[PDB]
Design a protein around this ligand. Structure first.
Ligand SMILES: Nc1ncnc2c1ncn2[C@@H]1O[C@H](CO)[C@@H](OP(=O)(O)OC[C@H]2O[C@@H](n3ccc(=O)[nH]c3=O)[C@H](O)[C@@H]2OP(=O)(O)O)[C@H]1O
Ligand SMILES: Nc1ncnc2c1ncn2[C@@H]1O[C@H](CO)[C@@H](OP(=O)(O)OC[C@H]2O[C@@H](n3ccc(=O)[nH]c3=O)[C@H](O)[C@@H]2OP(=O)(O)O)[C@H]1O
Lengths: 523, 523
């Protein structure tokens, strides 16, 4: 019966039904000429039942689909278009997102893709209520109030497309236009001017560089490869000297307020950057970002602690970015490969501004339920937990696909999630690569997934993921059943899902923290 | 056109569309038999255009329509029923609530009432989008995100009616049941168990009456008509004496912490009660609430200051009510009537528990845009301002009706609002009595309006209204134009809206605080 898969309180027929779509660079304009199924690719979904044109009711969540796919962490943001169906459209809200159950319950052909059937005249006759087409609607994410729409590709052809925003038109550096647009969602609400910040930072670096005492501290540098401990201890002195520069007076004042802002954290974080940025990464902004994005300790330079963004002005922020930057340049000779020059003031600053931006976006957002609902596993500051007990089970007979939620939070300052390792049984239980994602305070982030050793699939978030006091995430795992064969309990290669946290040195080697949650493969 | 008065983003066709309606004591059962227009009465509205059956999407707002209309302040609540239309129903959201404009814009007759025209087959063929009937839809109130629905009376005969809650059935005391139902709204939540508070109040009273120092302080009472000063002087020493009983231990720790909590304030509140309670009033709970509800200083007793409910447990509350009760008993002889401590430990405490219930209900709600948008008129702690400049102008040629908003706030503690004096031109410009209301933090309060001298209409709120730090009101004035003959500026008798606040003594006479706002009759 339809009644088991459809929520009537969320289903309605509406005239001139509009929704937004995040558009990539290079498509903003062409997409205003019409919606059409791409000639190749996944055409909306890894699973054929779910291929269709996707939109959402919130233009800021649409904006989260606008960044250049080739350079997801630093690339350009395209835009957001509004798509409108002329006349009457039936929105049919689903209670489950299991295409199979949807076909069983709606009495559909289980041999034909679900979303293709949604565009048939008979489905429309049956479920449309006098409308011209039906658009399937599902919740957008945990910790989100938005909605996601799944349109039939043919039916999408009737959509009228207008521009909502073209981020590139602004002529802004990096992903400024995009994050400033999304910052409008809270009228919460940190919206710094990153241009003024870049200016002030640049100005202050030049100034600190010339400060008599700063230059003398500089002279005391080993300027050669010294131990991690020696490099950090010189940077704790370098930081102390520099915090007395009048252009850093306000920072100096806050530094004592929270232990998160200590000299010792500026030095641990500066040495760790130097250590992970080689000639190649330094020369690439996207690599630089991927590399900084997995370091622990960003709450010190960002002034984020105990669930609040303390460094909340273009000035204390410019002061913090300048000091750290200046510290990275000193740490490069002692621990890295390149030199003080270039990177420290260019790619380091640009790349770090994008991470402030991502973390501030989270804090401007409502906190995804702080509390663990099942006992969490704690490690290196993070706490991971199944959202519910059923999320922990893989029913051996599940048909179609299954979804699993796991709450991830960290205890205090911004700690990163590098990736997720998911168990598979190739050709029976596969990862659905379009539906697995992580939602941070409701912002849904897609993943890039690949096969690794032992029937495990490694998924990396598309943009940086940070959890902390105030910023919690939901990992949503979508499994696809590509075979009607029997799935046994002792048949899976792996029986857990791993969470990769920040990168730390173990055995003098950089590794990523790792928390595992185990599955119960059961009938 | 339709797009000039229809909000399409809020207009849709839904299957089995349900809403809620507050039901009075005696109708909770018969209403479930069917929605039928009363044989007599205003049947939904003072204005013919607007007569129809009213519902809302929110069951707690529906709850605010359940109280017996003979004893509005203290009578019992009946309940809420869910009304559902079978099949398909069109919801037509309106950008305006002027029926003339909606008729003119939707190309309706101007000779026939709007909601009557809403149930015709023609209107339905036109605006229904394939639905069996059309329901009008309007914002519920300022400071609220609820929806009001207005059904056509005959179309409403199709509604199936279900019980949602019957408060009488709960068997509780006063409007307890109604009030905890509403507390479910927010889980800002303070949901005291008043049954436990009624008992600890009783227990503290007795314990206090047998207290050594208490009884002797009592012995020192002049026990007879003395002045306001001597009565107040004795009562403060009384308070100190009682504030040292092991049982008011909690309340003592908190008396000194905030000035609002001082004995001097318990003593003044006590003298004012004893002064205002005569034998006739002391014998009627309804009349006790009305009397107590217009007094200043109730915040001493409630422990409410600086935008916080300090007395937030059933123990300090009982403690506070006990002490107040005793003091009220002591005050009765000195500055009151033969209405002694009988009233003190009974009606005054039942009456007082209900007003904590109203104020606590406002605090559990989201504070209505605190800022005054045009310069406020200040006075006796209150601040009243036109919502917008337009709300202050009565355009001479307005056709149909017009509404005006006034924000009302008080500076700190709970100050009441006794009523509002509205101007009129009795043939042409009338107070629409159904549409005129006060909205307190989104809680919508109806008015009982009467004609007074000088072409003024006095409107009283159906339930107690209090403003303060964190509880803001919007007074909504709905005028109705009874005549096409245009208005002349010097035609009108009063050119102001008067706000009546708390009761005070002027020239040994009890009068109410009064604030005025001046209208502008333009074109
Ligand atoms: N004229 C056009 N008509 C149709 N598509 C066009 C057109 N021009 C460009 N496209 C792009 O084509 C894709 C498929 O429709 C979308 O981007 P993507 O990089 O594949 O977008 C990446 C993913 O985001 C989804 N997504 C995009 C935006 C949004 O707001 N919501 C959402 O879920 C896509 O379906 C896609 O899923 P899959 O990769 O799982 O296929 C879309 O923007
Ligand atoms: N079988 C019946 N069929 C229909 N109505 C019945 C039936 N039996 C009793 N009634 C009552 O008759 C009135 C008209 O519907 C309502 O109460 P009221 O005391 O007049 O209710 C007082 C006012 O509250 C309005 N109001 C009530 C509840 C609600 O949630 N929303 C709303 O705005 C009413 O229209 C009314 O306006 P007017 O007072 O301006 O007429 C209703 O409860």
């Amino acid at each position: 019966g339809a009644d088991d898969v459809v929520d009537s309180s969320k289903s309605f027929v509406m005239e001139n039904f509009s929704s937004y779509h995040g558009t990539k660079p290079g498509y903003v304009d062409s997409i205003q000429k019409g919606i059409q199924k791409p000639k190749s690719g996944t055409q909306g979904n890894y699973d054929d039942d779910w291929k269709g044109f996707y939109s959402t009711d919130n233009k800021y969540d649409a904006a989260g689909y606008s960044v250049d796919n080739e350079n997801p962490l630093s690339g350009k943001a395209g835009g957001v278009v509004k798509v409108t169906y002329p006349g009457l459209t039936k929105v049919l809200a689903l209670k489950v997102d299991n295409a199979e159950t949807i076909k069983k319950e709606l009495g559909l052909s289980l041999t034909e893709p679900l979303m293709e059937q949604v565009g048939t005249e008979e489905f429309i006759k049956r479920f449309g209520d006098g409308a011209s087409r039906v658009v399937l609607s599902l919740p957008f994410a945990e910790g989100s109030s938005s909605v996601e729409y799944i349109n039939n590709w043919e039916q999408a052809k009737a959509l009228s497309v207008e521009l909502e925003i073209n981020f590139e038109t602004r002529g802004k550096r990096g992903q400024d236009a995009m994050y400033e647009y999304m910052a409008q969602a809270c009228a919460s609400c940190i919206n710094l001017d990153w241009d003024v910040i870049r200016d002030k930072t640049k100005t202050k670096i030049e100034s600190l560089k010339e400060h008599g005492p700063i230059k003398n501290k500089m002279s005391e540098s080993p300027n050669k490869t010294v131990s991690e401990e020696k490099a950090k201890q010189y940077l704790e002195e370098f930081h102390q000297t520099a915090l007395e520069h009048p252009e850093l007076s306000e920072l100096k004042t806050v530094t004592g307020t929270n232990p998160v802002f200590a000299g010792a954290n500026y030095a641990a974080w500066a040495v760790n950057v130097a250590q992970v940025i080689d000639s190649e990464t330094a020369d690439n902004l996207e690599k630089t970002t991927a590399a900084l994005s997995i370091l622990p300790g960003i709450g010190s330079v960002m002034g984020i602690a105990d669930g609040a963004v303390h460094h909340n002005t273009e000035e204390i922020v410019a002061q913090s970015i300048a000091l750290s930057s200046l510290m990275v340049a000193q740490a490069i000779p002692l621990v890295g490969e390149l030199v003080d020059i270039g990177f420290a003031a260019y790619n380091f600053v640009e790349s770090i501004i994008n991470l402030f931006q991502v973390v501030h976006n989270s804090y401007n957002r409502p906190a995804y339920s702080p509390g663990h609902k099942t006992q969490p596993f704690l490690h290196d500051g993070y706490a991971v937990s199944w959202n519910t007990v059923e999320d922990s089970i893989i029913r051996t007979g599940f048909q179609g696909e299954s979804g699993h939620d796991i709450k991830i939070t960290a205890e205090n300052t911004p700690l990163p999630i590098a990736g997720v390792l998911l168990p598979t049984i190739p050709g029976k239980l596969d990862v659905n690569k379009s539906k697995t994602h992580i939602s941070v305070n409701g912002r849904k982030i897609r993943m890039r997934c690949r096969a690794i050793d032992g029937d495990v699939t490694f998924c990396r978030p598309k943009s940086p993921v940070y959890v902390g006091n105030g910023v919690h995430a939901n990992l949503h795992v979508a499994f696809h059943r590509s075979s009607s064969e029997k799935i046994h309990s002792n048949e899976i290669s792996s029986d857990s899902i791993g969470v990769l946290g920040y990168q730390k040195t173990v055995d003098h080697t950089k590794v990523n923290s790792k928390l595992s949650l185990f599955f119960e493969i059961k009938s």
